[PDB]
Every structure is written in structure tokens, then in C-alpha cells.
Amino acid sequence: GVPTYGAIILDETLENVLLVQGYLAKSGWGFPKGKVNKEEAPHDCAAREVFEETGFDIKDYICKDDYIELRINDQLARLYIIPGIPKDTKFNPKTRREIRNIEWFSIEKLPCHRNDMTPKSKLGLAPNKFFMAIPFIRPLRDWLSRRFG
Ligand SMILES: CC1CCN(Cc2c[nH]c3ccccc23)CC1
């Protein structure tokens, strides 16, 4: 897989993260991110995708050593951590063909795993609209503990 880059944007209180809602195959909520172009540096791809998806420019706030990186089915995903962005910021994409909605969500209320169907004696997972965000939630809570406490 071609690696992906983007951002976990947090507010001033560190309670809330900014998620985006796509369409079709991307129909639930996730962190803003996308596929790197040939020759493009990681930090630049991250700023481009977030600006295309949210209308907010992160270039002057990115710290090159502050990110969470996951491998998901042999595709690397890296999200730069961007704290302290005010909750009254107005977010407006270019691409409204791709993004249904943008919202702040409480970190303590987001799931860190999907629920089984063990009450139905059935295998697999129940659907969850946060499916794409889920893998980052526990590593984010751990990173915020270490960095801030
Ligand atoms: C955080 C608040 C709720 C999100 N809003 C912007 C927004 C919501 N949905 C969208 C779809 C396309 C383009 C922009 C938007 C800013 C204030």
C-alpha cells in the first residue's frame, strides 16, 4: 500500500478531536488523511489532505516528531498530533463531493474497539460509525498521558 498521512486535531482543553464523515466506502467518521503523491514529503501530504478535507491549514503547527503511526493491512498510516486549536474554528473544504460533515467528538466517549455479537451467538463485529477512527484511540490516550499527564 501507498502510505497515508494526516492529523489528529485537538481543542484547547484536550477533551475533543476533530473527525470528518465521508461517503460510500468512506461513509462513517474518521481522522482527515490520504494517500501520499510521488516525491511528496510526509509533512506536506499531511497538510494537503487536511486542507482539502477541512479548509484548515496545519503547516505552521506541525511538529515533525509528534505523530501516531499504525500499520493496517500492510498500509502505513501516520497522523500528526496538532493540539490547541479553538473549538469555534470554522472548517470548510474544497471537496464537498467527498466530505459530508465535520465535527468535534469527545475522546472519552469514543470507542477503542467495536462490540462483538456474543449475545446473538454469532461471529464477527457489530457495525460502528467510528470504525475508521477506532484503531487510533487507545494509542492517542496513551500519547496524551505521556506528553501531558
Ligand atoms: C466544528 C463545527 C461543525 C463543522 N463546521 C463545518 C462543516 C460541517 N460540515 C461540513 C461539510 C462540508 C464543509 C464544511 C463543514 C464548522 C463548525
Side-chain angles (χ1 to χ4, degrees), residues 1-34 36-37 40-63 65-89 91-119 121 123-145 147-149:
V2 168
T4 55
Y5 297 105
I8 302 173
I9 292 164
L10 302 111
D11 65 344
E12 50 262 284
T13 71
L14 314 176
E15 287 176 291
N16 306 302
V17 291
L18 191 73
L19 309 178
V20 304
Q21 187 183 30
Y23 289 115
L24 308 187
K26 301 177 166 169
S27 198
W29 291 95
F31 295 102
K33 69 181 178 28
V36 69
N37 290 324
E40 182 181 41
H43 71 283
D44 284 334
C45 171
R48 190 184 39 84
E49 291 284 0
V50 169
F51 188 75
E52 283 177 2
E53 297 184 22
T54 73
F56 181 81
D57 188 357
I58 64 172
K59 147 179 64 76
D60 291 337
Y61 309 111
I62 289 175
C63 304
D65 299 278
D66 296 345
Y67 63 75
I68 281 164
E69 174 176 63
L70 289 186
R71 202 188 50 239
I72 285 156
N73 302 322
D74 293 73
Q75 149 125 39
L76 197 91
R78 181 191 290 184
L79 304 172
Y80 290 90
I81 299 149
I82 311 285
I85 297 314
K87 251 191 310 304
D88 73 338
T89 308
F91 290 108
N92 274 103
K94 332 302 110 199
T95 59
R96 244 237 147 173
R97 295 182 135 73
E98 311 190 32
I99 299 305
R100 197 199 284 282
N101 202 2
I102 297 170
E103 194 57 65
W104 292 101
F105 291 85
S106 163
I107 293 172
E108 72 166 38
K109 285 185 175 162
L110 290 169
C112 63
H113 61 80
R114 293 152 71 199
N115 300 322
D116 60 39
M117 308 193 281
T118 58
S121 301
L123 297 184
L125 287 170
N128 190 297
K129 65 175 174 176
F130 298 109
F131 170 75
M132 292 177 287
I134 277 163
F136 298 91
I137 296 305
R138 182 53 51 186
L140 171 64
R141 286 178 184 151
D142 286 1
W143 192 106
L144 299 168
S145 293
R147 163 70 34 116
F148 301 96

Coordinates of all heavy atoms in Angstrom, one line a residue, residues 18 87 89-93 96 99-104, ligand 1, unseen atoms left out:
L18 N -11.2 16.4 16.2 CA -11.9 16.8 15.0 C -12.0 15.5 14.0 O -11.0 15.0 13.6 CB -11.3 18.0 14.3 CG -12.1 18.6 13.2 CD1 -13.3 19.4 13.8 CD2 -11.3 19.4 12.2
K87 N -12.3 25.5 19.5 CA -13.5 24.8 19.1 C -14.4 25.7 18.3 O -15.2 25.1 17.5 CB -14.3 24.4 20.4 CG -14.3 22.8 20.5 CD -15.2 22.3 21.6 CE -15.2 22.9 22.9 NZ -13.8 22.9 23.6
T89 N -13.3 27.4 15.7 CA -12.8 27.4 14.3 C -13.8 26.9 13.3 O -14.5 25.9 13.5 CB -11.5 26.6 14.2 OG1 -10.6 27.0 15.2 CG2 -10.9 26.7 12.8
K90 N -13.9 27.6 12.2 CA -14.8 27.3 11.1 C -14.1 26.5 10.0 O -13.0 26.9 9.5 CB -15.5 28.6 10.5 CG -16.6 29.2 11.4 CD -17.3 28.3 12.5
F91 N -14.6 25.4 9.6 CA -13.9 24.4 8.8 C -14.8 24.3 7.5 O -16.0 24.1 7.6 CB -13.9 23.0 9.5 CG -13.0 23.0 10.8 CD1 -13.5 23.0 12.0 CD2 -11.6 23.1 10.6 CE1 -12.7 23.0 13.1 CE2 -10.8 23.1 11.7 CZ -11.3 23.0 13.0
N92 N -14.2 24.5 6.3 CA -14.9 24.5 5.0 C -14.0 23.9 3.9 O -13.1 24.5 3.3 CB -15.3 25.9 4.7 CG -16.7 26.2 5.3 OD1 -16.8 26.9 6.3 ND2 -17.7 25.6 4.7
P93 N -14.2 22.6 3.6 CA -13.5 22.0 2.4 C -13.7 22.6 1.1 O -14.6 23.4 0.8 CB -14.0 20.6 2.4 CG -15.1 20.5 3.3 CD -14.7 21.5 4.4
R96 N -16.5 19.1 -1.5 CA -17.8 18.7 -0.9 C -18.4 17.4 -1.6 O -19.4 16.9 -1.0 CB -18.8 19.8 -0.7 CG -19.2 20.1 0.7 CD -20.7 20.0 1.0 NE -21.0 19.5 2.4 CZ -22.3 19.5 2.9 NH1 -23.3 19.9 2.2 NH2 -22.5 19.1 4.2
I99 N -16.8 14.9 1.4 CA -16.9 15.1 2.8 C -18.3 15.6 3.1 O -18.7 16.7 2.7 CB -15.9 16.1 3.5 CG1 -14.4 15.7 3.3 CG2 -16.2 16.4 5.0 CD1 -14.1 14.3 3.8
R100 N -19.1 14.7 3.8 CA -20.5 15.0 4.2 C -20.5 16.1 5.4 O -21.4 17.0 5.4 CB -21.2 13.7 4.6 CG -22.8 13.9 4.6 CD -23.4 12.8 5.4 NE -23.5 11.6 4.6 CZ -24.3 11.3 3.6 NH1 -25.3 12.2 3.3 NH2 -24.3 10.2 3.0
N101 N -19.7 15.9 6.3 CA -19.8 16.7 7.6 C -18.4 16.6 8.4 O -17.6 15.7 8.1 CB -20.9 16.1 8.5 CG -21.5 17.1 9.5 OD1 -21.1 18.2 9.5 ND2 -22.4 16.6 10.3
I102 N -18.2 17.6 9.3 CA -17.0 17.8 10.1 C -17.5 18.1 11.5 O -18.4 19.0 11.7 CB -16.2 19.0 9.6 CG1 -15.7 18.7 8.2 CG2 -14.9 19.2 10.4 CD1 -15.0 19.9 7.5
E103 N -17.0 17.4 12.5 CA -17.5 17.6 13.9 C -16.5 17.3 15.0 O -15.6 16.4 14.7 CB -18.8 16.9 14.2 CG -19.6 17.2 15.4 CD -20.0 18.7 15.4 OE1 -20.8 19.1 14.5 OE2 -19.5 19.5 16.3
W104 N -16.6 17.9 16.1 CA -15.8 17.6 17.3 C -16.5 16.5 18.1 O -17.7 16.5 18.3 CB -15.7 18.8 18.3 CG -14.9 20.0 17.8 CD1 -15.5 21.2 17.2 CD2 -13.5 20.2 17.7 NE1 -14.4 22.0 16.8 CE2 -13.2 21.4 17.1 CE3 -12.4 19.3 18.0 CZ2 -11.9 21.9 16.9 CZ3 -11.1 19.8 17.8 CH2 -10.8 21.1 17.2
Ligands
LIG1 C1 -17.0 22.3 14.1 C2 -18.3 22.9 13.6 C3 -19.0 21.9 12.8 C4 -18.3 21.7 11.4 N1 -18.4 23.0 10.7 C5 -18.0 22.9 9.2 C6 -18.7 21.8 8.4 C7 -19.6 20.9 8.8 N2 -19.9 20.0 7.8 C8 -19.3 20.4 6.7 C9 -19.3 19.9 5.4 C10 -18.6 20.5 4.4 C11 -17.8 21.6 4.7 C12 -17.7 22.1 6.0 C13 -18.5 21.5 7.0 C14 -17.6 24.0 11.4 C15 -18.1 24.2 12.9

